[PDB]
Amino acid sequence: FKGQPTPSTITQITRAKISDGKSVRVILSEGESTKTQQFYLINGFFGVAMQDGEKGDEVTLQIEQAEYETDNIVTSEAFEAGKLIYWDNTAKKFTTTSASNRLVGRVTDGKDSNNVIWFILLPQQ
Amino acid sequence: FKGQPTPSTITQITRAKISDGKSVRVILSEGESTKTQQFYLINGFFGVAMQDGEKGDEVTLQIEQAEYETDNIVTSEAFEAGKLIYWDNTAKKFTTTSASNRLVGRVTDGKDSNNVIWFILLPQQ
Amino acid sequence: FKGQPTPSTITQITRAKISDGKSVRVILSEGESTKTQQFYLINGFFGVAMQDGEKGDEVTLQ
Amino acid sequence: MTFSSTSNLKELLRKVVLDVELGREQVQLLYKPIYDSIADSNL
Amino acid sequence: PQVMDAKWALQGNCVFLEHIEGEEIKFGTINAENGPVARIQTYATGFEYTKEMKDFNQTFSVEILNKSIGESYNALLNHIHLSPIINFNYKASNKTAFKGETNDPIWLGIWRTLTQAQKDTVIAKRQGNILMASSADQIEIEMALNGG
Amino acid sequence: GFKELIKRDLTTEVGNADLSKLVENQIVGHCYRGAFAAVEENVQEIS
Amino acid sequence: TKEMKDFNQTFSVEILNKSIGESYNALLNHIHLSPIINFNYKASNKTAFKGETNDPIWLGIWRTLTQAQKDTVIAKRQGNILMASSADQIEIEMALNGGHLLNGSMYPSIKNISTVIYYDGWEVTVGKKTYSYKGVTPGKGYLIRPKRGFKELIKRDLTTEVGNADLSKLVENQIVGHCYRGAFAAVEENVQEIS
């Protein structure tokens, strides 16, 4: 307490793990907004925003590295199975061009007719 | 629903997490065969093929990024604990030399007498 | 009202039409006066003043 | 005073749901007369 | 209300893909099915007749206007209810052709076309239990529906 | 797939009458109704 | 997620159970019947459209049906159950029923068909993909001998289990339904029909 009835010493037990790190909380900047269940590169963290947000708001990105289903791709490029994919934030879409884009996974299931692809999310190197 | 009385718009509640992504299915090409529980670089995926698969077959790779035991090293190179480990697909063997080989993991147990090593599978970079 | 437990956002439903517009209400200037039931051009409005209007007094045109 | 003024304020206006048949067809096991079934957990 | 709100419901989706022993299972999904939206309109009509016409035109009286209102009213009823049916830009699915086209038939052979409709309304589940048609074809549509 | 909505089927009323013109009451009859219909109930026959 | 189970009141587990049941039944139909449809029939089993004639009523499949029955008694197949896409139901019914007179030709009712079945397809849109089991092709049918050359192996009927939750994310148990099943078919129990 504060008005302790007896002097005493408090000893701490240090431990570094605080949470599994599957989901990261982020705060939206001015030029950023998020829709439910969509991919966004916020503050260097790329993941599936699990809550809708707006400027200065706080959302949760899932970075589980699991397999995710998406179609927000430059449809001109063919996303064959196994090819690496990079998030282009200027266009806000998956590509296979690299350049300055952010490497964000590898495709498991190739581009079908509807431009839908299943890909595994790399761990944000 | 076919033949329903009235039209009704279908609203898809989009979700991303198709699968946990521990294992990825692939299809073997005309020059690829797999024995059960061995490492094969198929469609840019490196993992433990869990099924005997001949050319044209469908085989599941395991990419759980857990600890893995293997013996397919090049015997000349001395694998020390902690050294990065790559996959040479020309010779189809692990190797410490980077060159153009694909980075696959990090060695936990050094090269024993029997050329066995224990490593951890790195993500699909 | 004043002693409101909860904040309340007011929703003001509009309506443009306010009155029939038959009688326009005007103010008598200094150099102007009106008599009962007579035609006057008050403030650009021409109509039948129906009150004896003194300067600075009030009247009802038609 | 137009009713169009109160159009947007759906809360004020009474709400009634347009009753209609919504659902999906029930699937059925057509095969069963054709096939003869043998059940054994040890197969 | 002026507009009647739509219904809503939820369904799930899963496929049971073939499972290799090492396979990682693929998850399902859900979706929402929303009903349609209906609205009610206003119709109105009237007259504007001078009292002189009432006074001198002895033929004229209000009951003629009441009869005209009744006629216009029932005509508007049937038109508003049925004109969606007639005016609809039907696609190829709902257009059953004239299957009495077999040469040298008897004109109860429109029966064949009706049978085609009874087939097409049962290929699709939309079984049609009532018919509508111009009265000009009342004879044949009777003969088709009877023992031709 | 066919539904008729009837809020006010028919009301007829007598109204304005400019006595300065010796004009009788305007009569107006009106209804509040709606119809919902669909293509999921119909097949177009020819002949 | 547990939030989704709690706040979204319309959502529950029962929708997932219903969809599991529907997908399960649809795949049972697929595994059991797709061998019949997909099998590469040989000339011995196929029966062409014998009801061609010239200007016959569309119950002329009756003719095409009857020959097929003969084609089973020859070679002793003895087909007994009919399968056909529901589009061709009515004509098949008109064949199976006492199809009306035609030029005085009182064609009799076809017999020794105890049951007819209609395996249309079954489609479902999951997420951003569409998975569908093909039905019987329209304009085709199958006479089937029952239960002799067709055998269903049922190791595990259906096992639904609640799995690995994650308390670190307040996510409810993953639910997984799995089955161990198989089917065995045969060419010696089928005669194909056109229309």
Author numbering:
A (entry chain M), B (entry chain I): 3 to 127
C (entry chain N): 3 to 64
D (entry chain H): 2 to 44
E (entry chain G): 45 to 192
F (entry chain G): 242 to 288
G (entry chain H): 94 to 288
What do the study authors state?
The 650-Å-diameter head is formed of a near-complete T = 7 icosahedral capsid and houses the genomic DNA. It is made up of 415 and 420 copies of two capsomer proteins, the major capsid protein gp49 and the capsid decoration protein gp48, respectively. Within the capsid of the extended phage, internal density shows layers of packaged DNA.
